[PDB]
Amino acid sequence: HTSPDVDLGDISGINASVVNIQKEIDRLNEVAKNLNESLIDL
Amino acid sequence: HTSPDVDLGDISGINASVVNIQKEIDRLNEVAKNLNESLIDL
Amino acid sequence: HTSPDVDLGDISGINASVVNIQKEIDRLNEVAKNLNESLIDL
Amino acid sequence: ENQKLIANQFNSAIGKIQDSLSSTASALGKLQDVVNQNAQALNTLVKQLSSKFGAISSVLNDILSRLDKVE
Amino acid sequence: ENQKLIANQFNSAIGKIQDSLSSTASALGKLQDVVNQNAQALNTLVKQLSSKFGAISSVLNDILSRLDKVE
Amino acid sequence: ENQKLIANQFNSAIGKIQDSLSSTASALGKLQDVVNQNAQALNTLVKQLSSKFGAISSVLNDILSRLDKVE
Numbered sequence: 001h002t003s004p005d006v007d008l009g010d011i012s013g014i015n016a017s018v019v020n021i022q023k024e025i026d027r028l029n030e031v032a033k034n035l036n037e038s039l040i041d042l
Numbered sequence: 043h044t045s046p047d048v049d050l051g052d053i054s055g056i057n058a059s060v061v062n063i064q065k066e067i068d069r070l071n072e073v074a075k076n077l078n079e080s081l082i083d084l
Numbered sequence: 085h086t087s088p089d090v091d092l093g094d095i096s097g098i099n100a101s102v103v104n105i106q107k108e109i110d111r112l113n114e115v116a117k118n119l120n121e122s123l124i125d126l
Numbered sequence: 127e128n129q130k131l132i133a134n135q136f137n138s139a140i141g142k143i144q145d146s147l148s149s150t151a152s153a154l155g156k157l158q159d160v161v162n163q164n165a166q167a168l169n170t171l172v173k174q175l176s177s178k179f180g181a182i183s184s185v186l187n188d189i190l191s192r193l194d195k196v197e
Numbered sequence: 198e199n200q201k202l203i204a205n206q207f208n209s210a211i212g213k214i215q216d217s218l219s220s221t222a223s224a225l226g227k228l229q230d231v232v233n234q235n236a237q238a239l240n241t242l243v244k245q246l247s248s249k250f251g252a253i254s255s256v257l258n259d260i261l262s263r264l265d266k267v268e
Numbered sequence: 269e270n271q272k273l274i275a276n277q278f279n280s281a282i283g284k285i286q287d288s289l290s291s292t293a294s295a296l297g298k299l300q301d302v303v304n305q306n307a308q309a310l311n312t313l314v315k316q317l318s319s320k321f322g323a324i325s326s327v328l329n330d331i332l333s334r335l336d337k338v339e
Contacts, residue, residue, distance in 0.1 A: 001268055003261045006327050008254045008320055010247050014313050016236035016306040019229045024295035025222050031288040032218040035211050038281040040204040042270050043197050045190040048256050050183045050249055052176050056242050058165035058235040061158045066224035070151040073217040074144045080210040081140055082133040084199050085339055087332040090185050092178055092325045094318050098171050100164040100307035103300045108153035109293050115146040116289040119282050122139040124275040126128050128271055129199055132278070136203070139282055140210055146289055147217055153296050154224050157303065161228065164307055165235055171314060172242060178321065179249065182328075186253075189260060189331060196267065196338065200270055207274070211281055218288055225295050232299065236306055243313060250320065257324075260331060267338065 001265045003265050005258055006254075006261065008250055008257075008323055010250070011243050011313065011316055011320070014243050014309055014316065016239045016309045017302045018236050019232050019299055019302045021225060021229055021295040021298050024291040024298075025225050025229070027291040028218050028222040028225070028288055028295075031284050031291075032215045032222065035215050035218075035281060035284055038277050038284065039208050039211055040274055040277050042200060042204050042273070043194045045194050047187055048183070048190065050179050050186075050252060052179070053172050053242065053245055053249070056172050056238055056245065058168040058238050059231045060165050061161050061228055061231045063154060063158050063224040063227050066220045066227075067151050067154050067158070069220040070147050070154070070217055070224075073213050073220075074147040074151065077140050077144050077147075077210060077213055080206050080213065081137050082203055082206050084129060084133050084202070085336045087336050089329055090325070090332065092181055092321050092328075094321070095171065095174055095178070095314050098167055098174065098314050100167045100310040101160045102307050103157055103160045103303050105153040105156050105296060105300055108149040108156075109296050109300070111149040112146055112153075112289050112293040112296070115142045115149075116286045116293065119139060119142055119286050119289075122135050122142065123279050123282055124132055124135050126131070126271060126275050129203070132203055132271070132274055136207065136210075136278065139278075139285075143210075143214060143285060150221055150292055150296075154221075154228070157228060157296070157299060160303060160307070161231060161235070164303070164310060165231070168235060168239060168242070168310060171310070175246075175317075182253065182324065185328060186256060186260075189335070192335070193260070193263070193267075196335075200274070203274055207278065207281075214281075214285060221292055225292075225299070228299060232302060232306070236302070239306060239310060239313070246317075253324065257327060257331075264331070264334070264338075
């Protein structure tokens, strides 16, 4: 008898990262707004 | 005796969203095609 | 008696794809570098 | 003369920006396809996992019940 | 005259590129939101799965132990 | 004079668009890295889950078999 403790374990080392491109989106919107200071007014 | 019904349950509240940026891709392609109407022909 | 082999099975047909937009990122950086050959020098 | 220069370099820049916008559109399309596919994959995984754990629970209660019958 | 032409078509091009950059910003924002949401979903799935398999293991050892008690 | 104006503002616009394209390239690169990493994570999760459910099934059949031996 004396069956061993059958431990299945754990899903270790599995984890998803996270995008942080807020700086780039802010830069894109800032450039889209600043391009109004590049229009030609003869 | 009379072991209780050991219900493990369900993975509730877990669900992945879906990107719908088809409008933005269509706008990008439309602009890439409409920029031909902005070329300078002296 | 003779309980049947209760096989749970396997999570078949589940698999995640992989983005390969390295060509497009390389094109974007190449254009960002080649736009220096489009600056006007009167 | 400088007008031909401004026009030609503006046309070059607009062509390069057209190429860049087409590349960005293709990249966003591929990213959308893959993100939606991985989302559908995660969803079908959670569904099939719900079913699998349901079956596991079921055979578990069968085990406990027939054990209680033994005891 | 050609100066009005160059200016007007440059302003048209800059407006179209402003629209394209705003569209790219919106698309990247939506993609970021959805990728982060699916990442949080996968993380909570792995956590809840760890807990669920813990419970499964626990009832399993209870089963084996009381079986050994039977035997 | 207006030629210096057109040239200078075109150069400003091209610099800003260069910055925007570099930002879009960096954003798409980060998004690609994270989407591929989450894809690899989901794949290794489905693999490790297949193995874990295999082990669970195995101990389950051992349980049922030695139970039938008891009965």
